[PDB]
RNA sequence: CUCUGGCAUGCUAACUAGUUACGCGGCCGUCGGCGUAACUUCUUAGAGGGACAAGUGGCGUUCAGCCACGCGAGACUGAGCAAUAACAGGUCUGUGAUGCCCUUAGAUGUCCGGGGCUGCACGCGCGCCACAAUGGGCGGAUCAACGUGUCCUGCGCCGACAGGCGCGGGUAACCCGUUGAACCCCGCCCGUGAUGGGGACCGAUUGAAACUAUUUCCCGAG
């Protein structure tokens, strides 16, 4: 009657970002698939699961809450809200889904370049990206890209 | 007393046998707890985690799988033993007991009973694999 | 300066833009239905979805 | 033997073979690398006692295995340098001496069909070691 | 005691041979075994289409289907010569043992 | 004299039709040119599928 | 017992070659020419030295025994195939060369073919490579 | 810089700072104590027996330790 | 249309494919250990059943149809074949297809020997392998599909291994072979340092004629 965790009364505050409900009352599947990338990690799903399985441990031990409540909080606050196209520039709303797609792409890329030129474990940098992306710590990679795409959208409109 | 069904993901066929045993399942003599990968262990426990541990306590399951890879077999045997109990309850018990256990399995994952007809597409000349092509040189 | 307003898409008008990447739709607010504005959307959007527009002032000129 | 971890079994079986010094343990055990696809020497000193533990375990699963069939088990991805890597079999001598080391004990026997199989005594000690490791946890 | 094999390329000629062989032995009331189906063996030939060089790297992959059908019979070989003599069919080859 | 041993290497095998030493197809016992096997492919029993 | 000892030297000059005291007992001697990763793990195993140590943990007593096996390994049952030079051109004996020895040993073969004016020798003099392959575009 | 062995001066510094960290793993101890990875893994085995840290999960790729009895 | 993929405790079948009983032996249930009885779910491949926008709903003069949705092995997948007309596109080098021209004994005929086609200041293109943090290094332990085979290999013996010496099978669903593949998985080691990442270039074999080191094998350099 319970999955990998209990997840008693999962709360989804925003109505627009209420699409990933396959594990609620699968985002865990899409976060594992979006991690295996950058060429030399393709075709390794089990390798990313160990990274995610170790990521949930670091998240569960650093915060006294369910590990899934930090993953949803990261993509719901780091998701973009306006883009700039080539109109031949207008602040275009993306989607209720594009916010989920691009946010996960920024989380996997954030722990990637921050751990390439440094001696750090991927299982640690992934968990570090989630806690930094939540509430906008102003030091992560997804937030730095979200605020940059929103700043350029307001300028050229 | 005689139930044999096959579960196939891509090519691995797993023939699960369901006999009136005592309720201790094991893969061709090996218990299902020591089959690699260690992470892909809950997938074998899905017909026993979400399903109560009282219907399988009267049957014995010994499966034999051949073909495919590691992940192609771990998804094959979980489908083999799932369709095994639904066939035993059909031949000797009422369908109300059978239909009750089918709705609980499909509600979690559709691949537990329905087979996936997906196969690997053939390779076409001009590039690696089916779709991808070799790099074209202009001028 | 205007507050971040939420808006629910009531009917999609079709794909627009130069390369057909944007989707011009008409939105409908939930709190007060006394305002209706058309907004371009970049990405796959179903029927009845909710977008979060920031400006909520300028139009898209169809 | 199937009711226990196959890695914990080969580790517990490796101590049983080293406890009874009735093996061969040739002189060149620490100069040769275990296969041409490998590059350096093994890290563990008593690799011969661990190899003989896995060698006798495979005979329990399927009998009639020789030297040419054991080197196929212990094969890897040979780094061919700038050339794409491929599969290369192990060494026949290090596998033959292991099979000959088990012949000193009453664990393996040569079947007339070909290859090597297990003895009634070989399966006896193999199951008790699997039994004592199952009772460990 | 004798194993009759049927080596044929086209299935239409193969299925007709194994049909009359069972009926040709039925008139003697022999305990014959059903015809088994060996795995079909195809022969792959991936040839370049162009005769010499100039082209777009187009390969035409040929195939050659070789079908095998076995029929086992335990009966003396005293009068089986005429049973095989009435099994004439172009394109197929019978190799009794 | 006037007979050089040629049984291993390119020069002992040639096409059994045009007597050429390029594009040979000797798998399955054919020994034909790649530009000549296509001419008799329908006669041997090879069809495109 | 992970505390650093007083005899821990970061640099141990052996055979006019520096040895960093940071890596293991084997991969540190690899810096010396003529002794690689394969020859290091062997001479340390025949000397009965713990492989879980660093270059700074061996005192002068352990160092002299390691170098002794390196100079003349044939006396310690180290085979002849494992040696660098097996049949020398001027010596003719199985003796693995060392750092300061190989520079003079390889230049003899380069000068022998140069003095004798061989086709393989002139290529080392012209500044080109003795090709086992093509050199049309490879600079 | 980098250190392969342990120094007596920094030896006691590890017993008072590593058990105070929330995430105890060789990837973190290496960055904060300049340990070259290999000594960091063996150091946690010494701390595990003394009772300063406890093991929650051990794997060949990444091990995690927590604060011992802090609730 | 053809071919191929797809799913019936279905039909037709099986000692060159198995399964379930039973007997026997080993071991503390396990056993591709052995042997004969049932059977065709698994395997193989013969024919014929199945899928049509047929039912639901909506849209469209209501048609053509499209969209969504029951039920379902599919709301289907890839491939082969592919007109008319045309090109100074490629092919006289694949032909004993071939016009004309040239050569024809001191031969542009072809037999043999030697070398070149691999020769380098450089340019371009198709690829390989990397610049490792998601990796590399040593153990152990699980897994295959189209294939191929007179030449592929099996087992004993010897060998650092490439190999070598012996004994056998397979002209093949039979032997190789239950294709014990890598990636992946489980431990350990290494710790960002052109390092243990990357490898260029630089005596022991094997089929010959190792020149120009065919390539491999070991060590070192790298
Ligand atoms: Zn020809």
UniProtKB/TrEMBL annotation, chain B:
One of its GO terms (cellular component) is cytosolic small ribosomal subunit. The keyword Transmembrane helix does not apply. SUPFAM superfamilies: Ribosomal protein S5 domain 2-like. InterPro entries: Ribosomal_Su5_D2-typ_SF (IPR020568), Ribosomal_uS9 (IPR000754), Ribosomal_uS9_CS (IPR020574), Ribsml_uS5_D2-typ_fold_subgr (IPR014721). Pfam families: Ribosomal_S9. It comes from the Eukaryota. One of its GO terms (biological process) is maturation of SSU-rRNA from tricistronic rRNA transcript (SSU-rRNA, 5.8S rRNA, LSU-rRNA). Gene3D superfamilies: 3.30.230.10. Keywords: Ribonucleoprotein, Ribosomal protein. GO terms for molecular function: RNA binding; structural constituent of ribosome. Component of the small ribosomal subunit. PANTHER family: RIBOSOMAL PROTEIN S16, RIBOSOMAL PROTEIN S9. Belongs to the universal ribosomal protein uS9 family. Component of the small ribosomal subunit. The ribosome is a large ribonucleoprotein complex responsible for the synthesis of proteins in the cell. This is Small ribosomal subunit protein uS9. It comes from Danio rerio.
Automatic annotation (TrEMBL), chain D:
GO terms for cellular component: cytosolic small ribosomal subunit; nucleus; ribosome. It is found in: Cytoplasm; Nucleus. Pfam families: Ribosomal_S19e. Gene3D superfamilies: Winged helix-like DNA-binding domain superfamily/Winged helix DNA-binding domain (1.10.10.10). The keyword Nucleus applies. The keyword Nucleus applies. Keywords: Cytoplasm, Nucleus, Ribonucleoprotein, Ribosomal protein. Transmembrane segments: none annotated. One of its GO terms (biological process) is brain segmentation. Component of the small ribosomal subunit. This is Small ribosomal subunit protein eS19. It comes from Danio rerio (Zebrafish). The gene is rps19.
TrEMBL record, chain E:
It comes from the Eukaryota. It is found in: Cytoplasm. One of its GO terms (cellular component) is cytosolic small ribosomal subunit. Residues 3-97 form the Small ribosomal subunit protein uS10 domain. Component of the small ribosomal subunit. The ribosome is a large ribonucleoprotein complex responsible for the synthesis of proteins in the cell. The chain holds residues 19 to 115 of 119 of the full protein. One of its GO terms (molecular function) is RNA binding. This is Small ribosomal subunit protein uS10. It comes from Danio rerio. The keyword Plastid does not apply. Signal peptide: none annotated. Keywords: Cytoplasm, Ribonucleoprotein, Ribosomal protein. One of its GO terms (biological process) is translation. Component of the 40S small ribosomal subunit. Its main location: cytoplasm.
TrEMBL record, chain F:
The keyword Ribosomal protein applies. GO terms for cellular component: cytosolic small ribosomal subunit. Keywords: Metal-binding, Ribonucleoprotein, Ribosomal protein, Zinc. GO terms for molecular function: structural constituent of ribosome; zinc ion binding. Its cofactor is Zn(2+). InterPro entries: Ribosomal_uS14, Ribosomal_uS14_CS, RIbosomal_uS14_euk_arc, Ribosomal_uS14_sf. It comes from the Eukaryota. NCBIfam families: PRK05766.1. Belongs to the universal ribosomal protein uS14 family. This is Small ribosomal subunit protein uS14. It comes from Danio rerio (Zebrafish).
């Amino acid at each position: 009657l319970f999955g990998k965790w209990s997840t008693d009364d999962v709360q989804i505050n925003d109505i627009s970002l209420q699409d990933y409900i396959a594990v609620k009352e699968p985002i865990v599947e899409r976060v594992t698939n979006s991690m295996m990338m950058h060429g030399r990690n393709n075709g390794k799903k089990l390798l990313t699961v160990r990274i995610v399985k170790h990521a949930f441990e670091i998240i569960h031990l650093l915060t006294g809450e369910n590990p899934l409540q930090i993953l949803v909080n990261a993509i719901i606050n780091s998701g973009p809200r306006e883009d700039s196209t080539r109109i031949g520039r207008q602040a275009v709303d993306v989607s209720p889904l594009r916010r989920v797609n691009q946010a996960i792409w920024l989380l996997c890329t954030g722990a990637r370049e921050a751990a390439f030129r440094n001696i750090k474990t991927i299982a640690e940098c992934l968990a570090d990206e989630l806690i930094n992306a939540a509430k906008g710590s102003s030091n992560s990679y997804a937030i730095k890209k979200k605020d940059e795409l929103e700043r350029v959208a307001k300028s050229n409109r | 007393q005689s139930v044999q069904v096959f579960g196939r993901k891509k090519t691995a066929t797993a023939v699960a046998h369901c006999k009136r045993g005592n309720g201790l399942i094991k893969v061709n003599g090996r218990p299902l707890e020591m089959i690699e990968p260690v992470t892909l262990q809950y997938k074998l426990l899905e017909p026993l985690l979400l399903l109560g541990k009282e219907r399988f306590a009267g049957v014995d399951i010994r499966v034999r799988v051949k073909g495919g890879g590691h992940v192609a077999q771990v998804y094959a045997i979980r489908q083999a033993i799932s369709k095994a109990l639904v066939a035993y309850y059909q031949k000797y018990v009422d369908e109300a007991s059978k239909k009750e256990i089918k709705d609980i399995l499909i509600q979690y994952d559709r691949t537990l009973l329905v087979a996936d007809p997906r196969r690997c597409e053939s390779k076409k000349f001009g590039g690696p694999g089916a779709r991808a092509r070799y790099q074209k040189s202009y001028r | 300066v205007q507050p971040i307003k939420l808006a629910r898409v009531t009917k999609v008008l079709g794909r627009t833009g130069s390369q057909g990447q944007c989707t011009q739709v008409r939105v409908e607010f939930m709190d007060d239905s006394n305002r209706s504005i058309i907004r371009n959307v970049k990405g796959p959007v179903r029927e009845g979805d909710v977008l979060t527009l920031l400006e909520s002032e300028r139009e898209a000129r169809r | 033997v199937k009711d226990v971890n196959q890695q914990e079994f080969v580790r517990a079986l490796a101590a049983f073979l080293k406890k009874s010094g009735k093996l061969k343990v040739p002189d060149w055990v620490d100069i040769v690398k275990l296969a041409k696809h490998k590059e350096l020497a093994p890290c563990d000193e008593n690799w011969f006692y661990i190899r003989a533990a896995s060698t006798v375990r495979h005979l329990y699963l399927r009998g009639g295995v020789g030297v040419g069939s054991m080197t196929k088990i212990y094969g890897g991805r040979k780094r061919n340098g700038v050339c794409p890597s491929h599969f290369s079999v192990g060494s026949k001598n290090v596998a033959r001496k292991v099979l000959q080391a088990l012949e000193g004990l009453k664990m393996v026997e040569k079947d007339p069909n070909g290859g090597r199989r297990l003895t009634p005594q070989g399966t006896r000690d193999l199951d008790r070691i699997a039994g004592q490791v199952a009772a460990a946890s | 005691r004798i194993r009759i094999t049927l080596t044929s390329r086209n299935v239409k000629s193969l299925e007709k041979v194994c049909a009359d062989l069972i009926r040709g032995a039925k008139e003697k009331s022999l305990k014959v075994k059903g015809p088994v189906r060996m795995p079909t063996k195809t022969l792959r030939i991936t040839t370049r289409k162009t005769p010499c060089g100039e082209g777009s790297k187009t390969w035409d992959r040929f195939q050659m289907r070789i079908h095998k059908r076995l029929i086992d019979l335990h009966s003396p070989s005293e009068i089986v010569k005429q049973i095989t003599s009435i099994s004439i069919e172009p394109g197929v080859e019978v190799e009794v043992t | 004299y006037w007979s050089h041993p040629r049984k291993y290497g390119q020069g002992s095998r040639s096409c059994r039709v045009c007597s050429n030493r390029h594009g040979l197809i000797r798998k399955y016992g054919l020994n034909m040119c790649r530009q000549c096997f296509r001419q008799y492919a329908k006669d041997i029993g090879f069809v495109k599928l | 017992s992970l505390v650093i000892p007083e005899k821990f030297q970061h640099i141990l000059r052996v055979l006019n070659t520096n040895i960093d005291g940071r890596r293991k007992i084997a991969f540190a001697i690899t810096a010396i020419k003529g002794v690689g990763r394969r020859y290091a793990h062997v001479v340390l195993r025949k000397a009965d030295i713990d492989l879980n140590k660093r270059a700074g943990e061996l005192t002068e007593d352990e160092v002299e025994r390691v170098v002794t096996i390196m100079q003349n390994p044939r006396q310690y049952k180290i085979p002849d195939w494992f040696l660098n030079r097996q049949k020398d051109i001027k010596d003719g004996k199985y003796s693995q060369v060392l750092a300061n020895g190989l520079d003079n040993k390889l230049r003899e073969d380069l000068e022998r073919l140069k003095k004798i004016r061989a086709h393989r020798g002139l290529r080392h003099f012209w500044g080109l490579r003795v090709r086992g392959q093509h050199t049309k575009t490879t600079g | 810089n980098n250190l392969v062995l342990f120094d007596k001066a920094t030896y006691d510094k590890l017993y008072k700072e590593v058990p105070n960290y929330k995430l105890i793993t060789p990837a973190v101890v290496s960055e904060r104590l300049k340990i070259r990875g290999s000594l960091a893994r063996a150091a946690l085995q010494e701390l595990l027996g003394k009772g300063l840290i406890k093991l929650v999960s051990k794997h060949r790729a990444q091990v995690i330790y927590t604060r011992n009895t802090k609730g």
